[PDB]
Structure formats: C-alpha cells, structure tokens
Structure 1
Amino acid sequence: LDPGLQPGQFSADEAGAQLFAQSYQSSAEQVLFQSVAASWAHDTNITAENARRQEEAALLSQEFAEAWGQKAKELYEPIWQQFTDPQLRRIIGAVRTLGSANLPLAKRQQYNALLSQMSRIYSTAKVCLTATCWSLDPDLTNILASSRSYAMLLFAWEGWHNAAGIPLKPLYEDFTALSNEAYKQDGFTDTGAYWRSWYNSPTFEDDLEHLYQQLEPLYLNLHAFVRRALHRRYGDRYINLRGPIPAHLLGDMWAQSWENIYDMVVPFPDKPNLDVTSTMLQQGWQATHMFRVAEEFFTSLELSPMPPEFWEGSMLEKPADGREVVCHASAWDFYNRKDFRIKQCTRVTMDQLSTVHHEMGHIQYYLQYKDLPVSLRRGANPGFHEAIGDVLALSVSTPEHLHKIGLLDRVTNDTESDINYLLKMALEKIAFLPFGYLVDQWRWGVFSGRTPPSRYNFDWWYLRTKYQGICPPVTRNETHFDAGAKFHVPNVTPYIRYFVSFVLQFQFHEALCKEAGYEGPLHQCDIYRSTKAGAKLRKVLRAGSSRPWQEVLKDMVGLDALDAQPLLKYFQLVTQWLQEQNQQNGEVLGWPEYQWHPPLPDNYPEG
C-alpha cells in the first residue's frame, strides 16, 4: 500500500479519535475510486484480464482496510463504545470492522477470485437450443414476459436455473465459509448478523414479521385471483386451484413481479389500456428518451439533473459489439464527487421505465450527498436508497401522469379505472412482497449454518412455497442451486432492503403527496412539478447516513418506524374488491395441496 495512503498517528482519546476519522476519509476516496473504476471496467467488459485487474483492485482495498482498521483498533477498541459523540461511534465502529481484510493474504485472493467467478458465471450463463444461445437479458426475459406457451416457458425457466445455478453451488459454499470467517473476527456471529446490523434495530426481525402479517392477506387474495385467471388459460392439468402456482407462469423468471400477465387479469378491458409498452414501441421510444423523461421528473421537483459525466460515461444499452457485460442494472458512485453512472441493458418497456427511475433515484441520492465525508455517503438505511426512484415511479405510472407524457390518450376517473390501475400496481408491488421478504431469510439461514449445502435447494423451495405459493414446474434436487439463479445471490448483495423499500415507498409517497397539497385518493396523487415535495425529499437525500434512519423517517413522515398502513390505504379499494371477487367465486385462499407439482408436457423436452 502506497505511503500516501497509509495511516499516521493520533491520540488515544475521543479528540484524537476525531482527527483519525478525518484523515481516514481523506485517503479512502482514492481507494474507493480505483476499486469502482476497476469494477466498472469489468462489469461493462467481462474479460479474464479485467477480472484480474478488479481482483488486484480489491486486494488494495483490503490492504487499506487492514491498515486503518488495525490502527482504529489499536487506539480506540476498548474505549470507542463509551464515546460521547454517537456519529464518531458509527465511523470508528465501521473502521474497526475489517470484513474480508481480516482474512490472510491467500484467503483474500481466494475470496476475491470467488466473487469474480460467481459474477462471471451469472452474467455469461446462456441457454442453448442447436447452435444458437439465449442470454438472460434480453432473450429469456422476453420469453418469460410474453410467451404463453407452457413448454416454451418451462424450457426457459428450467434452462436458466440449470445453467446459472448448478455451476455456482460449489463456489457459493466456499464464499460463505470465507465470508463467515472474515466477519466473525469482527465479532459478529455470522455474515447475516453483520448485514442485519445496518438497520440498527435490536428488534429488526420481529418488526419485519409483524409487517408481513399485515401484508399477507393482500397477497393471498391476489394469488387466488391470479391463479383463477391462469386456470382459465392453462386448464385443469397445469393449474391446481388449491395448490401452488407453477413458478414459470407469472411473467417473470423469479415470479417476483406479475405485471406481465396484467392482460390476462384486467377486470375492465373497455377502460384505457394501462400497459403502455406497445404505445412506447409504436411511438419509437429509445433508452435515451427514457432516461431523459426520468431526469425531467427529477428537475420538475427542483432536484439535480444528471451531469455531463453521467451522459458521457453511462452504459444505457446492451453493447452490440462482441462484448459480454453484466446486464443487471446498477447505479454507480465513483467517490470523486464527479463521476456517477448507470449501467443498464435498457429495454423499451413500461417496467423498464420504472427501473430507469429507480436507478436514477440512486444517482440522485449520490448527487445530493456528494459533499459529505465519504463514510456518510450511504442511504439513511439501504432501503431508503432503494425507495427513492420507486416513489417517483408511483407518480409517473398514474393514468393522469401517463396522459401528460403522451403515453395514454384518454383520461378517466371512475371505480372501474381505479380497480384496473390498482390491480396492475398490486401485480407489481404486492406480488413482490413475499419474495422481497424470503430471499434474505434463506440467506440468513445459510450464513448461520441453519441451512448447510446439503439443504440449499430444499430450504429455498420451502420458503418459495411458504411465502409465494409457487412450485418448480420440474423436479429439483440438491444438485440444483436455484437461489444462485437469482442475481443478488452470486453477486453477494443483500435483499431485505427491497422488502423495506416496498413499505417505505408508500410511507414516502403519502408524505410527499400531503406536502404537495394533494387532497384526493392516494393512488391518484402525482407529485410532478411540486417543488415543496422536492424540498422535503431533498432533506432526506442530503442527509446520507449522518443521522439514524429512525429520525430521518420521523422528520419526513411523522413516524419513527416502518409502517404498512400507507401501503394498505393505497390499495384499500382493490384489496376489498379482490376479497369480494374470491368469496363470490368460492376460492380457497392459500395452497393447502402444498405437495402438488404440475406434470411435464407430453413432448418434454423437445420443442
């Protein structure tokens, strides 16, 4: 590690602790910058040489983390817990936390290579027919979204899970052992405990569970209604009205979002067609337009536009030249207060439009807190970061806002239209809740040793059935590693943030709508052009992680805790409607025939 990047001396009291933190953050900017740059170079251009460079960049970060970490522990370890300044307690608490830098050299390199190999496998995995091969993004995504052929959907589902999952398992086991080894030397019982500590709530898991209890009836009812619709199209052989839904029929590879089957479930088809995708295509929208339209919403709020460095540096389309990339969307902070980028293999679609806003939400956060000390450049909690863009997308997707941007010709205000809109939103937002909740439950069990390699898939599918009410359409066994077929698992990034942001985003929406002086039903609010809503959001963004999230929430929303009530109020009309539909249809809520799996199609597997 470069002499300039190494730590000096500071006194072993609270006041020396203050000066230590000041120089730490000064050197960290350059280390973070070269780390992110090396990751950028790789994720936008997956080569062995670029993986190597990224790995050597991670080693440097680990040396850095070691030097300042050992120093922070040398001076402050026994005393920093009783320190009077709680913000200093945070930063020093984070510097005494070495992570992977706790590993000896050989194991650091082992760790770094594993992250690189898992990433490459997920992002370059393909499903071959017999010479031509389909990628996840766009090919398999498109199939799952628009094919209504059972065997074609199954081919894509099975192919993807087999191709991504199977080779990942050995590497995932080794990663887990080394991640746990690293973080246990930091005093955590396992890596899952570390991840959970970011929410600093001794009661985190109980709070989440109480939240899910309130939300579960909404899911059960959406599930039953949707399953009925699928039965009408796939028949009695492939759909069990008292069983779980096959996992490949819900419009999405992970059955995590159901918006793509909206056309099958829409209650009042005579009302404006709220799936704007075809209108976008008919009008000739491109990635560029999508990002510009999203930017303009942000500026209508008197938030920052994207800087020139964003437009010149970002990757907004999947490259056409022989180049493999990580296609999964991400927002990037280079930690030089100048470069900020999005990397997204953008598709011309309504859900991709929401994704664009979601990604730009991350960037906007980066722009607003760029002048904070480096350690305070995070969300109030990770869920805050995830909720920013979705909140704007809640406004954008209202029929009225879509009309304003030329994506919907007619404007209607009636109970039929509302039911249509709220159902579409439920398929996006309510359908996700079980999945957003279950992913880290699985992964927390893995980290704790409750779920050993011998039960990876067994436990995955237990949770998938328990929460989502779905079943794999083909038989799985422990050779399969179906969790590794989801991006966030091999890319070693946490998931509970998304369950938190799905609750949080309706809390934010309510507050910004009230702040904008909007008096109507919550699901018809559009905060577009509300500078008052903008100023209120800006305060949250400019705060970064400088204050406990409970206080930031309180200032914004009026409550210091997560709360499902604004989500419930938002969906009240369709919740009551779906209940009534199901009772009139004499549906069974849930999947009592838990053991049920669909048969194979007659000509499986040949297409």
Structure 2
Amino acid sequence: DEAEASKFVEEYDRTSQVVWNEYAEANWNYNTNITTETSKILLQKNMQIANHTLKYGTQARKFDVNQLQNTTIKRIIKKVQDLERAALPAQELEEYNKILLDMETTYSVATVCHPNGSCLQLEPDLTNVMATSRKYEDLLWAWEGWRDKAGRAILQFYPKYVELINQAARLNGYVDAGDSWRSMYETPSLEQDLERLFQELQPLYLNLHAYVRRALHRHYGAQHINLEGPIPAHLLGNMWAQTWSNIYDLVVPFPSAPSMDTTEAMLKQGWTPRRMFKEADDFFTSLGLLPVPPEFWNKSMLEKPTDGREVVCHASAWDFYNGKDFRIKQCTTVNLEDLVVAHHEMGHIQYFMQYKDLPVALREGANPGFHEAIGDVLALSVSTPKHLHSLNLLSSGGSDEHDINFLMKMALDKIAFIPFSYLVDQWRWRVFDGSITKENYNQEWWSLRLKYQGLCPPVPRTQGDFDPGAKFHIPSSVPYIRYFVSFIIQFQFHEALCQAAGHTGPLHKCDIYQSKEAGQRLATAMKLGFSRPWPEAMQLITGQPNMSASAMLSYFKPLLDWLRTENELHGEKLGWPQYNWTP
C-alpha cells in the first residue's frame, strides 16, 4: 500500500513534467500564431497528454485513498484519480478538443467591420472605442458589432460543449462541470460564502451604480438614461461593463483637482510593454521575491505581433513545468490599465516560481483565487498617487479631494467588478446543472446582468444571440469565480501586508513597495502551492482563515461616505426598482 503509493507519486511527477512541458509549447505555438498547422499539432498533443492522464489516472483509482498513511501522497493520488477531459471516450475526447479549439479560434479571429471595408479586432480597436468614445451610437456599434460577430458565432458550439464537459465531469465522480469547478476550492460552504461576500459589498456597489447613472444622465441625456432604471451596458468604458474606470472623466468627484493623463504620461516619457514588465519585476524583487529568469525576456510575447500573425490576444501566464521556463503572452497597450494587467500576469509568474519544487499535482494556487490575487495586490500599491508620482506618471496627493478622486478611480475598477465576476459562473453553474438550456442561454444571462449589475442591453436581444460568447472565458472555458474571490481577498492581503509593512493611517494610502515583511508572507503562502487546504495559506498572509469583504470595505470607507452624502443630496433611488426598463 504505502510504498507503492510513494513510488507512483514519483513516477507520475517525473513523467508529467515531460508530457506537460511538451504540451505547453505546442499550446504556446497555437496561441502565438493561430494557424491550421499549429491547431493540428495541438489537437495531437492533446491526445498524448490524454494518454498520460488515462494511464496514471486509471492506476491512481486502484489506490484506496482512505488507507493511505501519508497526507501529501494521499492528496496527490486523489487528484490524479480525476482524469478531467481524459475520462471521455476517445471519440468524445477529440470532439470536445476540436470544439474547445474552434471556440478559441472563433473568438480570437473575430472582427467587426463597416461597409467601407475597415475591420476592427477586439484588441486594441473595439477596446479603444469602448473606452474613449462618448457617442451613444458609436459605442452601440462596437458593442452590438462585437456581440454580432463573436457572440453569435460561438452559439453553434456551446450546447455540444456543455454536454461533453458535463459528461467528463460525471465520469470523474461529479454531478456536472460547475460542480467539478467549485470543488477546486474544497469548501462545502462555498456558494453561501460567496453570496454573503457579495451582499457585503451591495451598499457600496448600489451607491456607485446610482452615482454613475446620474453622471451618464448628465452626459448622454435624460431620454436615454433612466434614473430609477438599469444602465445601458455600452456606456461604462469597457466592452462587458465589468470595469468602469475608463469613464472616470464622466464621473470625477472633484474636477477642480485635475490629475495627469497617466496614459499620455507613459507615452510622453517613452514607456514600452517591456518597461511595464521591467517595473513589475522590480516591484516583485523589492519585496524580496524572485526575479523573472533571463529566459523569460527572450521567450515571452510582451506585445501584439505585427508580422501579420493571428493570435489569442487575451493575456495569459505560462508554466512549462521545468522550473526555468515561465512566459507571459500579452497584446500590451501602453496605458495604466495594461500596467495593472502586466502585474497580474507577473503574480501568476511569481506563483509558478515559488512552488516550482512541489510535485506537479500540487503546483497550483492555494485556491484559484489566490493565484489571481498576487499581482493585483502589488498593482494596488502601484496605482496609488504616491507610487505613480514616483514613476513620474503624476505630479503629486494630499487633499481630501484628490483622495476621493483616487478612491473613485479605484472603485470604478474594483467595486463595479464585484457583481460582474459573481454573475458569470452563476450563469454557467446553472447552464452546467441543466437549469438553463440553449433556449434560455441569453435571456438568463441578461436576467442576471440586470439582477446583479443593474445593466440592460442597449439594443433588444433577438434569436441566435449568445452574449456570453462575446466574453473570453466562455468559449475559452476558463472558470470565472476565481476573479470574484481574488478581488475580495486581494484587499485582505493588502490590509495584512500593509500592517506587516507598518502602515499606519488609511489603507488606500498604503504602498507596500520594498517591504520584506510583506514579501515574506506572500512567499510563504505561495510556496505551499496546493499542498494544504487554503485557509492555511489565508491564515499565513492575514492571521486568519476566512474570506472577508471587510478589508475591501475599509479601503473604500471614505468613498462610501462620500457616495452616500452625494447620492442623498441628489435624491437617488439606490438600485433599479424599474428593472424592466430598456433604452
């Protein structure tokens, strides 16, 4: 029993390193150059990894996990018993593989053109229209156009995807795919936990929603904005209305206090994509944390290719499973937004390197949310006026008005995201559990878009529309609740790391730069990887075991007070009692 289990673990680990390393590069070649050849080679490398997973997964299932003495060994074998997609019969496996590939390619090659012959890709073209245009009709063209081309074209694949991913999940002992996804957190109370955490941030979100709805009322006209209704989903400076910081100019609390154009400030002093990752590297090393290998700089795709290549532009960070080769792939634009994104990517990279000496089965974040949180934590300190001024991207800081402005900028990004990141997998769990059918995909999406976010589609939805398909993580099959957890827990990390750094006074003024006390708590948690249940890693960073929104609420507390006063003086109905309103 016990000695065979130890040998199995070792054999699995060394062989997976080879098989997963070979898969990583084939997958990289498809991502950095979408062709029919790299698509073929990947689908073939899917079959080799499936063979490995099946061989070792079948053998792991003959071990009684219950009889196993060693805790680490027992936790590995149990994980290896989950074949995931490899549990599918050969014919379904290759269909599910082609489906996943066809959804990725469809999303990534989608363009939106005018009759004049000019066509727009999502990054950077449609993305810039969403962020900078203040014309109702232009935003609507980019918003509808993206959903017409990407969303609609994903719909032919999705019901077959749901069937196959669910089947593989049943074959691994789960009730459905969303059940398999939720189990990554190892928390039976998970749904309740997240629901409570969502309700905690309701008052702060409803007040932000009401404040911004008024500002859109000012700008876009009383005829197009309902002050008791949902906000049209194309007016928030982002394609999915998931973050609202790009319309900051429309909502500035104190316009008498102008802040530098951080983007033109980056362009003015000749910031590059390379510079942005070099600065993220520096923030990571300032904490006493690992620098990126030299190899990283030679192998990563830090900017969008210009040699006429078709790519997956939605960013990702890569582990090639040898402990040396880690890469980022980003279609980077020189702005504050992608500087924050670069840090997110470098936190994934830092995580790979921190747990690189664990068995591969344990080479994961404490939970998926821990992995998304790490780069966002540093980025919170980066985005402070103090630190931005030190990068020469600002000129100051000080007055309670600059404070409210900075906090508003932060809330338009962080608070606005809470209902959205909660939504996606609420929709998807109900698609997976069978309660939402292909008949109700879209209607149920907008039902939740209304309920949680207070948004309405600017144009009524017709038959054949599949608006979830216009969002990366859906055709790409990436779980989303990881980002909801991340946004809550990053402020907990921030609060506790600020305490270690000896920050007194308001949390939003904290800048953990160069703190070896902050660095030590992240490194100690990250080195665990997936070895222990996550409340341990949570305890190690924050001195306690639970997820809480209190650290986030504390950070925005001065904004909540300002929003309440400001909304109360404008007589705003919080929420959307007239929910059925459509523009």
Same fold (TM over 0.5): yes
Aligned-partner Cα distance in 1 for 2:260–2:400? 15
Identify the residue that residue 51 of structure 1 maps to in structure 2: 39
Q: What CA distance in whole angstroms lies between the structure 1 residues aligned with 2:256 and 2:382?
A: 22
Tell me the equivalent position of 2:480: 495
Following the alignment from structure 1 to structure 2, what is the Cα–Cα distance between the partners of residues 283 and 578?
A: 35
1:581-596 equivalent positions in 2, closer than 5 A: 581-596=566-581
Aligned match for 2:491, one of 492, 506, 522: 506
Which amino acid in structure 1 is aligned with residue 288 of structure 2?
E
Q: Which residue of 1 aligns with 2:425?
A: 440
* 8 Å CA contact 2:354, 2:526 repeated in 1: yes
Q: In the alignment, what sits opposite 2:364?
A: 378
What TM-score, normalized by structure 1, do the two folds share? Answer: 0.95
Q: Which residue of 2 is the match for residue 90 of structure 1?
A: 75
Distance 1:358 1:202 in 2: 28
Q: Secondary structure at the match of 1:237?
A: coil
1-structure distance, mates of 2:472, 2:152? 14
The equivalent of 2:416 in structure 1 is 431
Corresponding residue for 1:539? 524
Give the one of 212, 220, 232 matched to 1:246.
232
Residues 72-471 of structure 1 mapped to structure 2, 5 A cutoff: 72-73=60-61, 75-76=62-63, 79-129=64-114, 130-273=116-259, 275-410=261-396, 412-471=397-456
Deviations, residues 556-595 of structure 1 (Å, cap 9, x unaligned): 2011110111101111000111011111100011111111
* Residues 376 and 546 in structure 1, CA contact (< 8 A), matched pair in contact too: yes
Paired letter, 2:213: R
1:514-548 Cα offsets, whole Å, 9 max, x none, are 11111121100101111121112111121111111
CA distance in 2, matches of 1:350, 1:34: 35
User: Contact conserved, 1:445 with 1:451, CA < 8 A, in 2?
Assistant: yes
Equivalents in 1 of 2:273, 2:558: separation in Å? Answer: 34
> Which of 160-169 and 270-279 deviates more?
270-279
Q: Distance in 2 between matches of 1:112 and 1:392?
A: 36
Q: Runs of 5+ in structure 1 lacking a partner? A: 1-12, 599-607
**Pairwise CA distance, 1:596:** 1.1
Structure 2 counterpart of 1:496, which letter? I
Q: Deviations over 1:76-111 (max 9, x none)?
A: 1xx213534333332111111111111111111111
**Contact 2:46–2:97 at 8 Å: present in 1 too?**
yes
1:333 touches 1:340 (CA, 8 Å); kept in 2? yes
Letter in 2 for 1:562: M
2:26 alignment partner in structure 1: 38
SS in 2 for 1:441: helix
Task: Say if 2:23 and 2:45, in contact at 8 Å, map to a contact too.
Answer: yes
Match of 1:20 among 1, 5, 8: 8
Query: What is the CA–CA distance in structure 2 between the aligned matches of 1:259 and 1:45, rounded to whole Å?
Result: 31
* Residues in 2 aligned to 1:540 and 1:33: alpha-carbon distance in whole angstroms: 25
Distance 1:325 1:519, change over 3 A: same
> Is the 8 Å Cα contact of residues 274 and 421 (structure 1) preserved in structure 2?
no
How much does 1:288 deviate? 1.2
Name the residue aligned to 1:601. Answer: none
Contact 2:284 2:291 (C-alpha < 8 Å) held by counterparts: yes
Conserved? CA contact 1:310–1:341, under 8 Å: yes
In the alignment, the residues of structure 2 paired with residue 277 and residue 266 of structure 1 have an alpha-carbon distance, to the nearest angstrom, of: 17
**Cα deviation code 1:376-411 (max 9, x no counterpart):** 11101110000000000110111111111111112x
Name the CA distance, whole Å, in 1 between partners of 2:253 and 2:173: 54
Contact 2:80 2:361 in 1 (8 A): no
The match for 2:552 is 567
- State the TM-score, normalizing by the size of structure 2: 0.98
How many Å apart are 1:468 and its aligned residue?
A: 0.6
Task: Give the unaligned 5+ runs of structure 2.
Answer: none
Q: 1:68 maps to what in 2?
A: 56
SS at match of 2:33: coil
Q: CA contact under 8 A between 1:433 and 1:499: conserved in structure 2?
A: yes
C-alpha contact (below 8 Å) 1:456/1:478 kept by paired residues: no
User: What's the CA shift for 1:57?
Assistant: 0.5
1:250 shift after superposition: 0.2
Distance 1:217 1:14 in 2: 53
- Given that residues 130 and 239 in structure 2 are in contact (C-alpha distance below 8 angstroms), is that contact kept between their aligned partners in structure 1? yes
Offset, 1:272: 4.7
Q: Quote how far apart the aligned CAs of 1:555 are.
A: 1.8
CA contact (8 A) 2:152 2:464 kept: yes
The SS at the match of 1:341 is strand
- Distance change in 2, residues 1:275/1:513 (3 Å): farther
Q: How much does 1:477 deviate?
A: 2.7
User: What is the CA-CA distance between 1:17 and the residue it aligns to?
Assistant: 1.6
Shift of 1:274: 5.7
Distance in 1 between residues matched to 2:374 and 2:335, nearest whole Å: 20
The count of corresponding residues between Structure 1 and Structure 2 is 582
The 1:373–1:253 alpha-carbon spacing in structure 2 relative to 1, beyond 3 Å, is same
Report the aligned-residue RMSD.
1.1
Q: Residues of 2 paired with 1:88 and 1:205: CA distance? A: 29
Amino acid corresponding to residue 113 of structure 2 in structure 1:
C
- C-alpha distance after superposition, 1:245-279 (max 9, x if no partner): 00000000000000001111111123351651121
- 2:524–2:540 contact (8 Å) kept in structure 1: no
Query: How far apart, in 1, do the equivalents of 2:198 and 2:229 lie?
Result: 21
Q: Equivalents in 1 of 2:284, 2:463: separation in Å?
A: 47
1:524 corresponds to which letter in structure 2? K
Contact persistence 1:242–1:590 (CA under 8 A)? yes
Deviates more, 1:530-539 or 1:478-487: 530-539
CA contact (8 A) 1:275 1:350 kept: no
The more displaced of 134-143 and 555-564 is: 555-564
Q: CA–CA distance in 1 between the matches of 2:152 and 2:67?
A: 48
Name the stretch that deviates more: 547-556 or 80-89.
80-89
CA-to-aligned-CA distance 1:396-437 (integer Å, 9 cap, x gap): 111111111111112x32211111111110001000000010
- CA distance in 2 between partners of 1:395 and 1:263 (Å): 22
Q: Are 2:542 and 1:554 aligned?
A: no
| Cα distance in 2, alignment partners of residues 247 and 234 from structure 1 | 13
The equivalent of 1:527 in structure 2 is 512
